[PDB]
Design a protein around this ligand. Structure first.
Ligand SMILES: *[C@@H]1O[C@H](CO)[C@@H](O[C@@H]2O[C@H](CO)[C@@H](O[C@H]3O[C@H](CO)[C@@H](O)[C@H](O)[C@@H]3O)[C@H](O)[C@H]2NC(C)=O)[C@H](O)[C@H]1NC(C)=O
Ligand SMILES: *[C@@H]1O[C@H](CO)[C@@H](O[C@@H]2O[C@H](CO)[C@@H](O)[C@H](O)[C@H]2NC(C)=O)[C@H](O)[C@H]1NC(C)=O
Lengths: 112, 221, 222, 211
């Protein structure tokens, strides 16, 4: 994907880490897999790390997510033969400004 | 690279004036002061002056204040020096040198050296091959030669086989004989190679636009 | 000037001014120097390396592995148009892009023992090709590694083949690494391909308080 | 002026040993806590070269060069001495204009006594068509001192030595003998007796005019 916009673009993707070689086979046919992502600045090749882990929300596999910023005339290259959690939607950074992530337990008040 | 290419060797009638040039290349002309050094033939180094290109400020030695004049051509990326009304005194070699930083700096990149000869004499060589005696042979190795006699002014370049032979070669310094220079060269090859091998002596004298070749022919006897 | 610290230390051909630089007081680098990594890629822990520099006044460059000693590999074709010298394709000067010779890339085992009295900064690299084809064309062997060993250092790099956008014409990537070799320690390289070998390393002669000043300026004053 | 005086003037040191050249400044060359002395190397037949800046730090210069000193006197120490170290070495101060240099110190390498490879040459035919020139090379020898004699028919000149060769540490010598055609054609045997410490008896090479 070639970012044709005028803004930086935030792209998210992921890799799936299965429980065993069996689950590996059931989901993606191929037994040894990789995910390579390429950018002007980014270069990575992820290999899924199969292990047996405790169940969290019923699942014992794990998903690992990654992100990068794709500059305005740059392109991102995915190549994978399995365990790939693919981007469908990305985020255009439209307005950069001074903001914050406030940790609070409260909710809106309709005030100003 | 930091190369400093300077002017070619020069001859001046006593009382006249010279203007040797030094062409800068490989760095930013305007960031460093350029200087000139005089070396009285094989003796001691003397500081002449300095000039900073970017605005043309000069800094002279007491000794040379009068006779010297540093100038700079910014578009040309070139530093010039000018010596006015010369004497035998000024016959020596002049180095165009880049000094690193300011008043308290070291000269890191030295140029080749423009060598000036001050004499009323006219521009004048003659080349003679040196084949060994007809009945004598130096054992495992044969020494061959080339003789350059009666020329002015310095210098001359001596090569063997257009330069491809660079091994057993000695080119001796010139000497003054009846107010002319004279020097000799000695190529040394294995006894088997000669006279089978083409041994040619290539001599060049720029000052007269002369280039000569002499082939060493064994003693016709 | 227009060189970056990487460009300087790796020896970008456009950075010949700095082949043998004298002792310095401080270091000046532009914000966004043009002459960085002529062949595209990364310099690992680069910032940590700039920091080390800023605590340093004098590097003496020394030949640690002679280019001439590569008898059974090609140390002459490791050259790219991305790294032009005098208009001709070239490469980083302190580091050697070893390429297969006679359709063979024998396993390399070079070792260097720092016999100096100083810490020594050693740089090397790995090449990440575009495809299995390029892999084969350059180093005969299809699956390769580079292992480096030190008293403290232990790594084994495997080239990560992928298709990446062209940067300076090149779509492959080179990844560079460094380590400090202590005075009686030795560094062990073993590789069967994609190895970008050190030729020159840097003796840390004078450690002192210095800095890398980011400035756009270039004055003969004190 | 800060007069710089180097000592000794000429130094001959055995190969693989230690050369120790001194410098002495008339007044100090030493403020800001650093010494503003510099050492320069002039290998024969070429421009000087920068070795040491501010008296102690090396500029691509091998460690064999030890810059040392402070204040009024310093010392360039070359150790171990190698073959390609024949040169004249200069110290120059930058502490105070006008920049002043030392006299300079010429370094010579002591090596194995080699014998002169003599070879005598008759004048060219092209030259003779008015002057005669008997040339006689004496290449590759050591020690420096040699003694050429010319003999014409038993009865007894321009000489020229090269600098000690940077590569083998051996001198060479030319020895031309110029005459006019007529002065020349009035004799027969031309000899060239070199007397070295190598041979206890004179090395000779001669040639006879008519052969
Ligand atoms: C991502 O998409 C971009 C647009 O499709 C692309 O940029 C394009 O790059 C080409 C060369 O590869 C330029 O070609 C010509 O550009 C101008 C004409 O306006 C002139 O200077 C020359 O004639 C030159 O040859 C395109 O103009 C340029 N297009 C745009 C709209 O900027 C990127 O390079 C793509 N990036 C990746 C990383 O693949
Ligand atoms: C690097 O080289 C040196 C010298 O060749 C090694 O130091 C020697 O170590 C032994 C014991 O292994 C001592 O008994 C010697 O006297 C040492 N020699 C010197 C000159 O110091 C050193 O250990 C080598 N390092 C590696 C990592 O191989």
């Amino acid at each position: 994907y070639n970012n044709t916009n005028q803004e930086d673009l935030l792209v998210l993707w992921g890799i799936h880490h299965p429980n065993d070689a069996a689950e590996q086979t059931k989901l993606y046919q191929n037994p040894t897999t990789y995910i390579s992502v390429g950018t002007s600045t980014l270069n990575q090749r992820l290999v899924p790390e199969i292990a047996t882990r405790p169940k969290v929300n019923g699942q014992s596999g794990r998903m690992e997510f990654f992100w990068t910023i794709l500059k305005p005339n740059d392109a991102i290259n995915f190549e994978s033969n399995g365990n790939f959690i693919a981007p469908e939607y990305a985020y255009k950074i439209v307005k950069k400004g001074d903001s914050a992530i406030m940790k609070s337990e409260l909710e809106y008040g309709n005030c100003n | 690279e930091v190369h400093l290419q300077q002017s070619g060797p020069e001859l001046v009638k006593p009382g006249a004036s010279v203007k040797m040039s030094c062409k800068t290349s490989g760095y930013t002309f305007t960031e460093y002061t350029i200087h000139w050094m005089k070396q009285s033939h094989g003796k001691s180094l003397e500081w002449i002056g300095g000039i900073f290109p970017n605005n043309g400020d000069t800094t002279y030695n007491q000794k040379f204040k009068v006779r010297a004049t540093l100038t700079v051509g910014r578009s040309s990326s070139t530093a010039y020096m000018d010596l006015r009304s010369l004497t035998s005194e000024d016959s020596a070699v002049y180095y165009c040198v880049r000094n690193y930083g300011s008043s308290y700096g070291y000269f890191d990149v030295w140029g080749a050296g423009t060598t000036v000869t001050v004499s009323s004499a006219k521009t004048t060589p003659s080349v003679y091959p040196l084949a060994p005696g007809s009945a004598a042979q130096t054992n495992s190795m044969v020494t061959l030669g080339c003789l350059v006699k009666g020329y002015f002014p310095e210098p001359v370049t001596v090569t063997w086989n257009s330069g491809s032979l660079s091994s057993g070669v000695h080119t001796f310094p010139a000497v003054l004989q009846s107010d002319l220079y004279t020097l000799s060269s000695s190529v040394t090859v294995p006894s088997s190679t000669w006279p089978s091998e083409t041994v040619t002596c290539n001599v060049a004298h720029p000052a007269s636009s002369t280039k000569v070749d002499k082939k060493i022919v064994p003693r016709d006897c | 000037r227009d060189c970056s610290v990487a460009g300087w230390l790796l020896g970008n051909p456009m950075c010949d001014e700095f082949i043998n630089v004298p002792e310095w007081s401080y270091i000046v680098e532009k914000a966004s120097p043009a002459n960085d990594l002529c062949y595209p890629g990364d310099f690992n822990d680069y910032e940590e390396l700039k920091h080390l520099l800023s605590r340093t006044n004098h590097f003496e460059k020394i030949q640690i592995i002679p280019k001439s000693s590569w008898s059974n590999h090609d140390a002459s074709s490791g050259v790219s148009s991305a790294c032009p010298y005098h208009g001709r394709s070239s490469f980083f000067r302190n580091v050697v892009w070893l390429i297969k010779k006679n359709s063979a890339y024998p396993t390399i085992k070079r070792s260097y023992n720092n016999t100096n009295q100083e810490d020594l900064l050693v740089l090397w690299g790995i090449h990440h090709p575009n495809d299995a084809a390029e892999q084969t064309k350059l180093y005969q062997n299809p699956t390769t590694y580079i292992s480096v060993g030190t008293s403290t250092l232990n790594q084994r790099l495997v080239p990560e083949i992928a298709t990446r956008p062209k940067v300076n014409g090149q779509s492959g990537r080179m990844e560079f690494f460094w380590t400090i070799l202590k005075p009686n320690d030795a560094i062990n390289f073993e590789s069967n391909g994609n190895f970008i070998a050190p030729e020159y390393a840097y003796k840390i002669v004078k450690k002192g308080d210095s800095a890398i000043m980011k400035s756009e300026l270039e004055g003969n004053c004190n | 002026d800060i007069v710089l005086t180097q000592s000794p003037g000429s130094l001959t040191v055995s190969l693989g040993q230690r050369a120790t050249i001194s410098c002495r400044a008339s007044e100090s060359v030493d403020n800001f806590g650093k010494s503003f002395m510099h050492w320069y190397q002039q290998k024969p037949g070429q421009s000087p070269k920068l070795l040491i800046y501010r008296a102690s730090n090396r500029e691509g210069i091998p460690a064999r060069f030890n810059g040392s000193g402070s204040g009024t006197d310093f010392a360039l120490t070359i150790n171990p001495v190698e073959a390609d170290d024949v040169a004249t070495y200069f110290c120059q101060q930058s502490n105070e204009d006008p920049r002043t240099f030392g006299g300079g110190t010429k370094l010579e390498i002591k090596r194995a006594d080699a014998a002169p490879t003599v070879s005598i040459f008759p004048p060219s035919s092209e030259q003779l068509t008015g002057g005669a020139s008997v040339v006689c090379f004496l290449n590759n020898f050591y020690p420096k001192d040699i003694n050429v004699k010319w003999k014409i028919d038993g009865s007894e000149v321009l000489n020229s030595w090269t600098d000690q060769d940077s590569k083998d540490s051996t001198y060479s010598m030319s020895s031309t003998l110029t005459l006019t055609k007529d002065e020349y054609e009035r004799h027969n045997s031309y000899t060239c007796e070199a007397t070295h410490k190598t041979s206890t008896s004179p090395i000779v090479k001669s040639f006879n005019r008519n052969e």
